[PDB]
Amino acid sequence: GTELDYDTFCFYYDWYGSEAIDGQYRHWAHAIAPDPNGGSGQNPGTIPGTQESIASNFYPQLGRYSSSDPNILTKHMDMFVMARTGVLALTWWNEQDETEAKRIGLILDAADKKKIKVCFHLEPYPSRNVQNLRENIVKLITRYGNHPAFYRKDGKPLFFIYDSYLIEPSEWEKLLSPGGSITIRNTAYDALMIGLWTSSPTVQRPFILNAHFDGFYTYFAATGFTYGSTPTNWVSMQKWAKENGKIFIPSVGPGYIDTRIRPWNGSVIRTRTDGQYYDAMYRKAIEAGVSAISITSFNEWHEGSQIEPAVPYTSSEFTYLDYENREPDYYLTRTAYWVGKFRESK
Numbered sequence: 001g002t003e004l005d006y007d008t009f010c011f012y013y014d015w016y017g018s019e020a021i022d023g024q025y026r027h028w029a030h031a032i033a034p035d036p037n038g039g040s041g042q043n044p045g046t047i048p049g050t051q052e053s054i055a056s057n058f059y060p061q062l063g064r065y066s067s068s069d070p071n072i073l074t075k076h077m078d079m080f081v082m083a084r085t086g087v088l089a090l091t092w093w094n095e096q097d098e099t100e101a102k103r104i105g106l107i108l109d110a111a112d113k114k115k116i117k118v119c120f121h122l123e124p125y126p127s128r129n130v131q132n133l134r135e136n137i138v139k140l141i142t143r144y145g146n147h148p149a150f151y152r153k154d155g156k157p158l159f160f161i162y163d164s165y166l167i168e169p170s171e172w173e174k175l176l177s178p179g180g181s182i183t184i185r186n187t188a189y190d191a192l193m194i195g196l197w198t199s200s201p202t203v204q205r206p207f208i209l210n211a212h213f214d215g216f217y218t219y220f221a222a223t224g225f226t227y228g229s230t231p232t233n234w235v236s237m238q239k240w241a242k243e244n245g246k247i248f249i250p251s252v253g254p255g256y257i258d259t260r261i262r263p264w265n266g267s268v269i270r271t272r273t274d275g276q277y278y279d280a281m282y283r284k285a286i287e288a289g290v291s292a293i294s295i296t297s298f299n300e301w302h303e304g305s306q307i308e309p310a311v312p313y314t315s316s317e318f319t320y321l322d323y324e325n326r327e328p329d330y331y332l333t334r335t336a337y338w339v340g341k342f343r344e345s346k
């Protein structure tokens with residue numbers, strides 16, 4: 001009851017920088033978003049990413065780390081082993097820069113040492129469309145597909161597609177129908193394509209079918225943020241998935257808070273309550289009878305959904321939230337608990 005689960009996907013962010021390694025404490029410093037309902041002339045400012053003031057309501061046990069530091073990567077992979085999360089679902093922004101390329105190779109290498117697998121979470125990069133998506137899928141499978149840590153499920157790579165609704169089903173069909181003009185089906189570049197189910201079934205069911213997605217995930221850690229992230233819908237979403245040959249990968253998270261970077265977004269806060277929120281959400285995923293589960297997140301520190309260890313910290317600039325009556329690694333060990341319960345259910 002300690003082995004990795006390769007149907008458990010944990011969303012991982014590689015965008016953190018340090019002055020020493022990256023030239024800037026990347027992402028630890030971050031713009032504060034203006035209030036989308038708050039009128040003109042806002043000067044919301046920025047979080048400077050100093051030791052005292054970072055762009056999170058929580059504070060990492062590992063400090064203001066670099067995602068390109070091989071020693072941090074080793075520690076993260078040991079944390080995945082503790083959590084029993086076999087798949088690292090890597091945020092991918094199509095930066096087309098040598099620093100991205102280096103980082104992806106470092107992550108794959110570190111993952112392989114611990115038998116962790118890596119798949120890609122394809123983000124909404126500029127001018128994203130099905131043609132450049134195909135080209136990027138080809139590039140990723142070509143560059144990384146023979147890496148021993150590259151994930152496959154029953155012989156197929158798997159990609160999560162964030163904000164897949166931003167692209168019309170008539171475009172998706174070209175890529176994802178077996179008859180599509182630029183199909184990946186039956187090619188060397190075929191993959192399980194997992195789209196983001198947001199809103200109501202009346203909208204999302206025909207979209208998933210007409211776009212030829214292999215499955216869907218929900219992402220948001222905050223319960224009730226969307227229809228898809230409301231766990232009382234998961235039984236019915238799974239029933240529909242099974243009836244239509246789709247893979248449902250609900251996303252569970254331990255809490256949510258992003259008010260350092262989005263001070264106006266307090267309605268989305270979901271309190272951790274010493275792990276009871278995480279337990280409730282993970283239980284609903286398991287009870288829905290799904291084949292795979294995703295975890296939002298390993299380390300989206302801006303959104304306060306991370307399971308990565310956090311420590312108490314009060315600086316002159318901010319009093320951070322922390323894991324309260326739980327130890328810093330509690331969310332990793334509680335993840336392992338739920339992975340066990342999930343496996344018992346399969």
Ligand SMILES: OC[C@@H]1[C@@H](O)[C@H](O[C@H]2O[C@H](CO)[C@@H](O)[C@H](O)[C@@H]2O)[C@H](O)c2nccn21
Nearest residue numbers: 011030091121123124162219220300302303
């Ligand atoms: O991973 C899914 C998606 C991300 O696209 C999204 O990134 C945006 O927001 C973050 C701040 O949270 C910012 O730092 C990024 O540069 C990007 O603009 C964010 O991680 C998120 N939240 C829900 C879904 N996402």
